[PDB]
């Protein structure tokens, strides 16, 4: 059994095999480069059959330096990755070989990266509420354990900052085993994350592996599968709750598009993959908390071109439960936690789960902001002189409540040079109800800018 | 500084002819041994002595 390269173009390779033996789909193939300076061995994965014992395959290393006729050898197996107890505390590549300590490993168990979703009989819904020190997330869209978290927005809208903010909060509050991974992240932030993680003395239980831009897309859509396999391996055998962190899944989708363009298949809307929904569902349904296994994950998604008409995040919209969205205008206003209250929603908010006072407060805030937005069109030119006082008071209250949501998280310690703040939910709801009573109308608006709590509110207001 | 530029200008107008004077002697003396150089060229081209 030997393989010969017949034609190559781009990262895609076509190979021909003898009649006697033809490996099945998703199998590792070995070839080498005979050039001196760029000496390297490469591995191909089975993509599709073309008849006459012709097989199409994809590379995860750059294809420069190849030459036709090179022998091709197979392993007769899919891609196996190492799994074990001592995995944590080390950085990993796409191949799974250790990066910090070369040669570390090759002595643990090996599992494939192609698995199947769990049976429906073991499925179970959850309602375990989760609380966070930030007031806005708790008041509007309270977090639920065992579910999925979505962070929607454009480009450069502070997604990363809130990501490490939440991860710091969770790490300080909660221990256990945790896994961070992602695709579409820069080297500098990764080194900074490593340094901060070492500072926190929690890197011993954290699993780290991720890709970069300057890589062939094969790694780009395989490292996420490797991370999910690690997550399932830790969840099943250990039977312990594991924190999962994934960032910038959008690149993933884009990666697929690229390879489809190389395949020659018929293009789709906006030049996308012929089939993307099925793979999206396969990726999403791999994450599921079992009855005996509580799993929490968060997802950072990138919206291309600041347009939501793209089906790229629209498809993901159908696989989420708790979503928080960001907008450019809110950032331009000045408040860093640029989270849209109008668009944001969650499926956990219900009077059956939470008391009626919280429901009433949320409904009142929603109606006030809706009325403010409705009047924004008229006020945009004429203003309040034409408008009545009955709506002028509403305008004032809306402005004050909008400015109050601003907060000073500790993650900005490297920018603002000030400590963060945290508030319990009871104080938050009490202060918000007091504000909605309108007692604070006498106070200036600017005092509400970047304040910690009602005590600090009063201190700042009376300081001027 | 304009007068310094002018001074450098006549330094240039002297150098441009001093170089010509040297190039005259270079032109005269270039043909001292060019025949031997060409013979070496022919010998190394043919692979045998010229």
């Amino acid at each position: 059994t030997a393989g010969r390269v017949v034609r190559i173009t781009g990262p895609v390779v076509d190979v021909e095999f003898p009649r006697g033996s033809v490996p099945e789909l998703f199998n590792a193939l070995h070839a080498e480069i005979t050039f001196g300076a760029l000496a390297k061995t490469l591995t191909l994965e089975v993509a599709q059959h073309l008849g006459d014992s012709l097989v199409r395959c994809i590379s995860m290393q750059p294809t420069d330096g190849l030459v036709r006729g090179v022998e091709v050898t197979d392993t007769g197996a899919s891609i196996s990755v190492p799994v074990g107890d001592g995995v944590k505390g080390h950085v990993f590549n796409a191949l799974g070989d250790c990066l910090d300590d070369p040669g570390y490993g090759k002595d643990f168990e090996h599992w494939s990266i192609h698995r199947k979703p769990p049976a429906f009989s073991d499925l179970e819904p959850r309602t375990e509420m989760l609380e966070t020190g930030l007031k806005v997330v708790d008041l509007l869209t309270p977090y639920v354990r065992g579910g999925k978290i979505a962070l929607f927005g454009g480009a450069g809208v502070g997604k990363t900052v809130l990501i490490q903010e939440m991860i710091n909060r969770i790490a300080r509050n909660f221990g256990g085993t945790s896994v961070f991974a992602g695709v579409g992240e820069r080297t500098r932030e990764g080194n900074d994350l490593w340094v901060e993680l070492a500072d926190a003395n929690v890197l011993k239980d954290t699993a780290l592996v991720f890709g970069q831009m300057d890589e062939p897309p094969g790694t780009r859509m395989r490292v996420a599968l490797s991370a999910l396999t690690m997550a399932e391996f830790f969840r099943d055998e250990q039977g312990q709750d594991v924190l999962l962190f994934i960032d910038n899944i959008f690149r993933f989708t884009q990666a697929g598009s690229e390879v489809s363009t190389l395949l020659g298949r018929m293009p789709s809307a906006v030049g996308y993959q012929p089939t993307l929904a099925d793979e999206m569902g396969e990726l999403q349904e791999r994450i599921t908390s079992t009855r005996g296994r509580s799993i929490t994950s968060m997802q950072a998604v990138y919206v291309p071109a600041d347009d939501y008409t793209d089906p790229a995040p629209a498809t993901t919209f159908a696989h989420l439960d708790a979503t928080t969205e960001l907008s450019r205008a809110v950032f331009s206003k000045g408040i860093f936690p640029a989270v849209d209250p109008l668009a944001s929603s969650s499926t956990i908010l219900d009077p059956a789960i939470v008391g009626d006072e919280h429901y009433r407060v949320a409904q009142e805030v929603i109606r006030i902001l809706q009325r403010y937005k409705d009047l924004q069109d008229i006020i945009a030119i004429l203003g309040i002189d034409e408008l009545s006082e009955e709506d002028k008071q509403l305008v004032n209250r809306a402005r004050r409540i909008e400015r109050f949501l601003s907060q000073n998280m500790m993650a900005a310690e490297q920018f603002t040079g000030q400590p963060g703040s945290t508030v319990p939910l009871k104080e938050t709801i009490e202060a918000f109800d007091k504000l909605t009573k309108g007692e604070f109308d006498h106070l200036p608006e600017q005092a509400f800018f970047l304040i910690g709590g009602l005590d600090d509110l009063a201190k700042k207001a009376e300081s001027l | 500084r304009a007068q310094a530029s002018g001074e450098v200008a006549q330094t240039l107008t002297q150098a441009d002819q001093q170089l010509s004077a040297q190039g005259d002697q270079v032109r005269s003396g270039l043909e001292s041994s060019v025949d031997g150089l060409s013979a070496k060229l022919a010998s190394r081209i043919l692979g045998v002595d010229v």
Binding site: - | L12, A15, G23, V26, S38
Partner: protein, 93 residues
């Protein structure tokens, strides 16, 4: 200092003139030499001998392999069938 670099530039122009003169003389005189001195027939074969020496002093080289694969298999099978079948052919057959 700039004027010093233009002095060096003028020396570069002199070197350029040197290059042009050397090229012209080499081309013309070497061409005349080769087309006049060694144009005799009796020398030509000698060159071949020298060339032959080169051919005898080179290290050996490895040479192999002297259009569809299914078409190739069918053609090979047809050739084998002819070889097995053409044994009984006569001069006129």
């Amino acid at each position: 200092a700039q004027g010093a670099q233009q002095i060096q530039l003028m020396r570069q122009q002199l070197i350029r003139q040197l290059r042009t003169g050397l090229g012209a003389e080499a081309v013309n005189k070497a061409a005349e030499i080769v087309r006049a001195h060694v144009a005799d027939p009796q020398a030509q074969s000698a060159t071949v001998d020298r060339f032959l020496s080169e051919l005898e002093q080179m290290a050996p080289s490895s040479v192999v392999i002297d259009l569809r694969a299914a078409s190739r298999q069918s053609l090979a099978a047809l050739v084998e069938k002819f070889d097995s079948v053409a044994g009984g052919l006569d001069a006129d057959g």
